[PDB]
Amino acid sequence: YQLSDYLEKLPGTTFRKLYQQPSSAFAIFRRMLPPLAKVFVQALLYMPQPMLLSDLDVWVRPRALSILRSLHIVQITPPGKDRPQEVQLTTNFRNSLRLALEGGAAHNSFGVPSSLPVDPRIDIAFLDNYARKKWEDILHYVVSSVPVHGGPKASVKDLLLAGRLVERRPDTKTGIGITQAGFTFLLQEANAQVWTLLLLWLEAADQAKAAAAAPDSIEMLSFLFMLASLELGRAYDTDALSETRRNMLPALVDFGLIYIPREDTRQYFPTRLATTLTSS
């Protein structure tokens, strides 16, 4: 619904930057492309030259409903461009997806688990309370902007404001009132709610870059996919991340996708919000 809509707006140049990254290409591939599109793309990545449409039809076989829809989804997202009789895949996407399917991606590009002992008090229950309360607060905030005829971190308020889930208002003590977006946002399922905010967190950095040209969204998104491949209740090693990702842990903590302990900022714990992402 949301990620798809977001992606359908992205210009080619970004897609090819995003597909410098196996995990990304493989994540999209895995959990955007429908059962058939996968099948079509597999063969396509394997076969020698930009082959014949008719041969892809011979690949199709049964059921025979999505034969059209599958062409569109493929057409919009990847850099898998074609001209009648010829249907190519973009080097970047090919190269990226291959490495992924051959499990030959950088060793240090995944959630490196941590050797350090795990505080007995940090269980799935803790990591659920934490995350839950974190989201409670955000939801309470956007709620407390509904006319009545502390809350979250300042960085989130400003993000909701920028996102137009909330609008500045002269009348109200808060200085803030709910938008129709905000209403819609409040009705969405906890998954859709997290994506709604994350996509804003992304757009924000574009809206910034654009001006600041008087990390990029792609880096932020890649990392998100990574966090969706990690395991819940397991501690991961901070140092193994790239500077750009070490530099995103605060935002994701604010959002409740990550617990750090104060005791040891060598181990980051993804919450259920982080691992669910792509499975929803």
Side-chain angles (χ1 to χ4, degrees), residues 70-244:
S70 294
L71 274 31
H72 139 66
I73 292 164
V74 162
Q75 266 189 297
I76 194 152
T77 20
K81 53 208 174 66
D82 61 34
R83 188 64 206 144
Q85 300 155 40
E86 267 193 44
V87 46
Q88 197 69 15
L89 262 60
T90 278
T91 348
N92 268 47
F93 188 90
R94 190 190 296 286
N95 307 147
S96 289
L97 216 306
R98 219 144 210 171
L99 287 163
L101 292 172
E102 292 163 24
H107 299 251
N108 219 65
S109 71
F110 293 124
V112 184
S114 97
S115 43
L116 312 193
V118 171
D119 203 310
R121 291 190 308 280
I122 299 180
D123 46 11
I124 286 157
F126 176 99
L127 283 179
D128 285 342
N129 282 286
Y130 167 88
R132 162 183 6 161
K133 185 171 287 283
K134 273 268 196 197
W135 259 74
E136 281 191 26
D137 292 15
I138 287 163
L139 295 171
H140 183 287
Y141 175 78
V142 169
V143 169
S144 78
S145 75
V146 186
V148 185
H149 306 61
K153 251 225 187 162
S155 35
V156 169
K157 298 174 205 209
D158 313 2
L159 180 56
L160 293 168
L161 192 60
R164 301 182 280 180
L165 311 194
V166 146
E167 50 171 30
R168 289 197 175 283
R169 273 185 107 325
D171 32 17
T172 46
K173 301 193 161 157
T174 60
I176 274 133
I178 201 178
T179 68
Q180 291 282 96
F183 277 137
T184 300
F185 173 73
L186 279 183
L187 280 182
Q188 277 181 323
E189 293 288 1
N191 186 75
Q193 283 194 334
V194 170
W195 277 107
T196 309
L197 184 54
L198 290 172
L199 293 188
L200 296 173
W201 175 49
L202 288 179
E203 299 216 38
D206 302 311
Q207 283 182 125
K209 164 157 180 168
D216 212 338
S217 38
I218 315 176
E219 296 188 43
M220 286 178 255
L221 181 44
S222 280
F223 185 30
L224 285 167
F225 294 135
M226 192 266 258
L227 284 171
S229 93
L230 307 197
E231 230 266 336
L232 172 56
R234 188 175 302 166
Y236 289 77
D237 183 286
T238 315
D239 293 356
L241 289 161
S242 33
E243 198 60 31
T244 60

Side-chain angles (χ1 to χ4, degrees), residues 57-75:
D57 288 301
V58 160
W59 253 292
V60 166
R61 286 265 158 79
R63 294 215 201 185
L65 193 159
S66 317
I67 296 177
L68 265 278
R69 267 179 160 276
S70 294
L71 274 31
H72 139 66
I73 292 164
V74 162
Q75 266 189 297

